[PDB]
Structure formats: structure tokens, C-alpha cells
Amino acid sequence: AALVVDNGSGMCKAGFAGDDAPRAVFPSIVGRPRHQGVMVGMGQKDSYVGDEAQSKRGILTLKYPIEHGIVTNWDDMEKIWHHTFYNELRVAPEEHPVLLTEAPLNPKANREKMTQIMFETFNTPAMYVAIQAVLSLYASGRTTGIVMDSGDGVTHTVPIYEGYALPHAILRLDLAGRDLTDYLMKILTERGYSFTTTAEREIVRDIKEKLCYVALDFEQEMATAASSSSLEKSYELPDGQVITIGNERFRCPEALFQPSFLGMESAGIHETTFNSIMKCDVDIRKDLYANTVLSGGTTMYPGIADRMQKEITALAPSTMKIKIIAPPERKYSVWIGGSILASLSTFQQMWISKQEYDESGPSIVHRKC
């Protein structure tokens, strides 16, 4: 029974093979105590990783070991992988092969480091690495379609034609969810609410994850909010106070489609899907326009599928139909797509054995995967 460990920028997923609805799901967070522990009786640990660090976030610091896909700190991630394998899954990695996922267009050093860690620190019998968006396609059942994935810091649009991707037209944008959360707390200050600490960062993420929607027409929706308070909602803080958000509900989700608010020259996430299409063949675009499957947690705003279809239509010629798919479990599309890979008996021959790694080192991954 192989394993799948889809590490994410802001939250990680884990579970066995031949499964859906990932089992061991906890945020990729590492926090260490900030103050001095007066109590002696308590068994305070050096660091809290995962779900434990979220409950006690009042005194912790909540450092992210992964940012924009590229791993900044590798010392703490070994805690995360050890945490995933031993406590959450309770499985010895020395007997069961492990699968990994990784974003496209990333430095070769990052994926080489994972190869080193699993084979000596964990001593996995075999390991494989696959692109995230390729897993996202045949999690929807198809094999020919552009995958537009948006996580915390990575927004990559990978056109796909078959079991093989198209590296020529792979695009990327640093406009994903984590950047929007920092924007939400920036626009919460005009209302008199200030959020600065990393503990108060997680609070703002829950405001976005519950009271934020994508407006079909931003220009029209602005007049409705200003004319009357027909869109205001109230949210309760853990301490007990309640705050009200007006036009901040749709302003921060829409920065994807107008990144000029964030001060970035990059074109909108709607346009980066259209531009990524024109980099492929003219014959190919027929199948690539009707299968624009959306994946990733950031693509779960209410009305995002409707908004994308309207804006893509204006850019594209009328001769081509547009169909923005949206599977019900689009949040965990990456995990389930890789889950069926290990189920196949044919995939056994596509492993990176320890003997192969020993004779080639970490460089074996580049020629194989």
C-alpha cells in the first residue's frame, strides 16, 4: 500500500493509496514558544507542528516552512514529514513506498532535496515525484485539458494534452491565496480593525474562507454597497468581539482578476489562462478551451467559475466554446489524482529504487521524472 503526501504551501494532505477524501489533513505550520514557561509540571515541548500548533497559537509564532512552493527552511520540514508518517498515519516508511507531488517550474535543488531525505533519513523503499497539475486533470476523469491551480503562493496554468504535459506553455503567477490574506488585513484597517501578528493572520484567513465571494461585475457591485448596506456581514472573533465587513467581502477575492490593486504588473489570473492557451498549437486549442478545469483551494470562492467564463469569452473569439469545469472536491483534486496512480499495477515499473538512487545520488530524479 503506497503513500501519497501532497505537500502544500499553506496546508498539507496525506493518506494511503487507492483512496479519496484525504485522511491525514493538517496545515503545514511549525510554531515554537515565544514566552518563558514558568510552570515546571507541564511537559512543554520544543516545537509544535501541525494541528497542535493551531490550537495553542496564542503563545506560538506559527512559521511557514514553505513559501511560494520553494522551500525556505528544510530543518523544520523534516519534522513535518516525520510528524505525518509516525503520528498521523502510524506507518513505518521503511516498508511502504511513498509518492510525492511538486509544483511545475521550480528550482532543481528543491526536488533534489526531497530525494535525499526520503532515502536515508526515512529509508523509503521507493519514491516518485509528479507534477501537481497533471494529477489534477485525471482527478476530473479527463486526459486533455488545461489545469488552472491556485494555492497559497503558486498560481500555475499547465496545458495538458495526454498523460504527458506541455512544458512549453506552463505559466506561473505569484498571486495566490496567501498574498490575498495579507491584502485582506490591509483593507481591514480602513474600518478600524488592525491585525499584525502571525496569530492574527490565521484569523483573517478564516474571515476570507467564510465571508468572501467573487462579484460578477465589480463596477456594478460597488454602487450597491455604497448606496445601501445590503451586503454587510458580521463575524465573531475568538475573544468574543464581532466585526462587520462591507465591500471588503468581494474586493480581496477579485485582486486575482485585477492585480493592479496589489501593485503587481502581472496580468490577471483570468488572462494568464487565456495567454497560456495561445502558446499551444492552433489545432490543439479546440480541446484545450472546453476543458478548463479549475483546482486548488483558492478557486473555491462563490462565483469564481461564473466570473472566469464571462471574462474568458471577451478575449477569446466567438468561434470557440468555453466550459469552466468545477469538480465538487476541487480542493483536494491534487491528492485524489495521485491516489489512483499508485493503484495501477503498471506504475510499479516506474519507481525510483534505492539501488538506482545509490548509483546516481539525488540527480536521478531529473532524468527519470
Binding site: 476530473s140 476523469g141 486533455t144 495526454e162 498523460g163 466567438s318 489512483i340 495501477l344
Partner: protein
């Protein structure tokens, strides 16, 4: 000859693959050349001939691509294929979906591959076992193709409908537009005044799309434009011409779509129903398959719905050709997309042109007050 012909008799027990080389008789090279004293004994032995004569002694059903893709697809929905076969047999609208059926036929191999599997169970893989169950249904290729009209026929007819009604309404709206006629006259008279004494003196008409080229004409001072001149002149002493953009409201959708695209789509769907007609005759009709009237009666309403589209599509050709004669242009060098997009862009130019006139007047009022 030169004592260099010790013909070695071999007589192999088993015939081998003889290599063909150009013959070198021992008459030319035997005088004084190479290979006169070959050390044949230094290589000759018993083991070499015995070994040499031995070497020269004279997902399985699916290919590489389909075996993995079918295995991936069969695990994509993680549901038994036995119910899937019954679902397509009964045409169950809940399980069946346009996306599910579109990438299904991609996973069928050639029709031959599905034949001997039935004649040939648990030993075979999930991809091979799926083909055995699916291949048992007669006429797999047409029947699965037979499903995929009503899943999209309703979608296509509802998409052509706003494409046709918008153009016809745009044609009718432009037909009765007096402001368009009033604007057109002003350009012709002023243009004829400046074109005097040239190759275009006293022109009794100009081709379409020249109005969008009026902006490209400048004046003595670069800020002052000919397109803005008409808007400035109209707002001064010849009002009610500014209302022409409001008279046309479906030109944007009229400009978006072209009749050429519509004709291809209409021709394709005519061939689609024809396949069902051949299917009905080739496969006479029930209880076992719930297809019953889901296709034969669907064609009845499809042909009824189709006939209305033919009239509406023909309504362009009657209207546009008269429109083509109205502005003098054959619908062969000019089409719906190019003509209306040119007019769609002209509407944007005029509203912007009158906008900049207001802006310049605002600065004009600002300096007058100061």
C-alpha cells in the same frame, strides 16, 4: 596457386544464415597480397563452432497508451463498470454526463480489439476485464455514439438562438435608424468640400469603414481632429444626431458572431441527425434497452426545432443581402464579423470623441473663468 589454398571443409550439422560477400577468387589476390598466411588454426577449435551454430540456427491486449489511460479512467469514477454498461444500455441521465461520455469514447480502442476478448477472466487486468464486459454489448461504436446527440443538441440550439436574433435585430434597428442617415450625410458633404479639385471631387458615396478612418485625419493643429470636428459641429447647431449609438444595442453581439461560423455549425448538426436515421433503420426496435423513444422521438422534436433554425438562418440571407444592397457591398468580400466590428468600433470612437470634446470644453471653461 601460391600454396595458399588449404580449403577447409566444414559441413555444418545445421544450416545457418549465409552472409553474401563479393567473391575473391584465389587467382588475382593469390599472387602477392594480404590474407595469404591467415592464422586460421589460431582461431579454429571445437567450442567456437558449437556456440556459434546455436545462435544462428536456421494490459496485454491493449497497447501502451490505452492500457494506462483506460486504467486511469476506470479508476477515475471508481464505480463498477457492470452498472456503467447497464447505465449506457438504459441511458440513465443521472450517471451519464457529457464530460463522462466525451472522454469515454476516447478510451474505446479500435472495434476489432473488443472482439476476441469475449471469445477468450479474473487473470486479466482491470483494463482488459472492462473491455470484456463492455465489448459484449453489440454495436458498441454506434450505440455509444448514438447517445451523444441529446446531451449536446439542446446546448447547441440554445447557443445559436441569441446569435441569430441579435444580428437580425441589429439589422432591423439599423434599417430604421434616421440618425445614422443624418450622420452619414454630414460626412459626405464636408468630405466632398475638401476633396474638391482632386481625384475624389464631388463623390456620390463612399465605402463602409471609412468613418473609422476619419479619426486618422488631422488638422492644422494636431489636437484638432476631423472625427471630433463632426461631434463638435453636431453638438453646436445640429443636435439629435448624438443619439445614434443608443439606436443600436445588439451590434456588439452582432459584431461578435459571423454568419460563416453559423453555417458550419448548422451543416454539422444536419449530419448528426442523419446518423440517427441510419441507426434507426439499421437497428430496428424496448424493455431491454431504455433507449425506446429517447432518440427516435427526440429526432421528431429535433427536426421540428431544426426547421425553425433554417428559417431563422435564412432570415439573415434575405435581410443581409438587402442590407448588402443597401450599403452596396456583396456578402462575399465583406461578412457579418468585419462589417459590424468596424461599426461596433465606430460607436466607441464617437462616444469617446464627444467625450474628449467635453473635456476640452472643461479646460476651455476653466481658463475663461480664471
Amino acid at each position: 596457386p601460391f600454396g595458399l589454398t588449404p580449403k577447409k571443409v566444414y559441413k555444418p550439422e545445421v544450416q545457418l544464415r549465409r552472409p553474401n560477400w563479393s567473391k575473391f577468387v584465389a587467382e588475382d589476390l593469390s599472387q602477392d597480397c594480404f590474407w595469404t598466411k591467415v592464422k586460421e588454426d589460431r582461431f579454429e577449435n571445437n567450442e567456437l563452432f558449437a556456440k556459434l551454430t546455436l545462435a544462428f540456427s536456421a494490459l496485454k491486449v491493449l497497447d501502451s497508451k490505452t492500457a494506462q489511460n483506460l486504467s486511469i479512467f476506470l479508476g477515475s469514477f471508481r464505480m463498477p463498470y457492470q452498472e456503467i454498461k447497464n447505465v449506457i444500455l438504459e441511458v440513465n441521465e443521472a450517471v451519464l454526463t457529457e464530460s463522462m461520455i466525451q472522454n469515454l469514447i476516447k478510451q474505446m480502442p479500435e472495434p476489432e480489439q473488443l472482439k476476441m476478448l469475449s471469445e477468450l477472466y479474473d487473470d486479466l487486468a482491470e483494463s482488459e476485464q472492462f473491455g470484456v464486459v463492455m465489448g459484449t454489448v453489440p454495436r458498441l461504436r454506434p450505440r455509444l455514439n448514438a447517445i451523444l446527440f441529446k446531451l449536446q443538441f439542446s446546448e447547441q440550439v440554445e447557443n445559436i438562438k441569441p446569435e441569430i436574433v441579435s444580428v437580425t435585430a441589429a439589422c432591423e434597428e439599423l434599417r430604421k435608424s434616421e440618425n445614422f442617415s443624418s450622420l452619414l450625410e454630414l460626412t459626405l458633404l464636408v468630405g466632398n468640400y475638401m476633396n474638391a479639385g482632386s481625384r475624389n471631387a464631388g463623390a456620390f458615396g463612399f465605402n463602409i469603414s471609412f468613418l473609422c478612418k476619419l479619426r486618422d485625419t488631422k488638422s492644422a493643429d494636431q489636437k484638432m481632429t476631423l472625427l471630433h470636428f463632426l461631434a463638435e459641429l453636431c453638438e453646436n447647431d445640429h443636435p439629435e444626431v448624438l443619439k445614434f449609438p443608443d439606436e443600436l444595442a445588439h451590434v456588439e453581439k452582432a459584431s461578435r458572431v459571423s454568419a460563416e461560423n453559423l453555417q458550419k455549425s448548422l451543416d454539422q448538426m444536419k449530419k448528426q441527425i442523419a446518423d440517427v436515421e441510419r441507426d434507426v433503420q439499421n437497428f430496428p426496435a424496448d424493455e431491454k434497452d431504455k433507449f425506446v423513444e429517447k432518440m427516435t422521438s427526440f429526432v421528431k422534436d429535433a427536426q421540428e426545432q431544426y426547421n425553425k433554425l433554417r428559417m431563422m438562418h435564412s432570415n439573415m440571407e434575405t435581410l443581409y443581402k438587402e442590407l448588402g444592397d443597401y450599403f452596396v457591398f456583396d456578402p462575399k468580400k465583406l461578412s457579418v464579423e468585419e462589417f459590424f466590428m468596424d461599426l461596433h468600433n465606430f460607436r466607441n470612437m464617437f462616444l469617446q470623441a464627444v467625450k474628449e470634446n467635453q473635456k476640452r470644453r472643461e479646460t476651455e471653461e476653466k481658463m475663461r473663468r480664471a
